[PDB]
Amino acid sequence: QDAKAGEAVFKQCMTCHRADKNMVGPALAGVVGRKAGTAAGFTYSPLNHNSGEAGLVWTADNIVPYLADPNAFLKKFLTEKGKADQAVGVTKMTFKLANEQQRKDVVAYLATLK
């Protein structure tokens, strides 16, 4: 949860994400507190879209497990909602971050991206 240390991890995310405009992935400013699949103008996968529709709001706590394995997280979320059929597809985000400390730190960074 060291946002400064998260800066170095965030450089990887900058391959596809910008704070304020969409790119390969959606704009991330204000992602902490945002309903999944709702960045204006971005076309999400059904998996991410359906997760937000089922109520997923990204928080400082749940983005951490998400980054370890985006597909597993979103599939598990929808399955827990009794919506496993809406989780058959995969996310467009083909990146994963195995290290837990790196995930905690980059999510602390995200929380400062207002």
* Residues at the site binding ligand HEC, with contacts judged by CB under 6 A: 9, 12-13, 15-17, 24-26, 31, 34, 36-37, 39, 44-45, 47-48, 58, 63, 67, 91-95, 97, 106, 110
Q: How far is the CB of 82 from ligand HEC (least distance, A)?
A: 21
49 is in an annotated binding site: no
- Would you call 22 helix, strand, or coil by DSSP? coil
Closest approach of ligand HEC to the CB of residue 2, in Å: 15
Name the residue among 32, 22, 20, 30 with its Cα closest to residue 66.
Answer: 32
15 versus 79: smaller Cβ distance to ligand HEC: 15
> Which residues sit directly before a break in the chain (C to N > 2.5 Å)?
none
- Residue 59 · residue 85 · CB < 8 Å: no
13 is in an annotated binding site: yes
| Residue 114 CA neighbour count, 13 Å, CB half | 0
Q: State how far the Cα of 99 lies from the Cα of 57, in Å rounded to an integer.
A: 23
Closer residue to ligand HEC in complex, CB, 27/85: 27
In this complex, which beta carbon is closest to ligand HEC, that of residue 80 or of residue 110? Answer: 110
Bind-site residues for heme c? 13, 16-17, 93
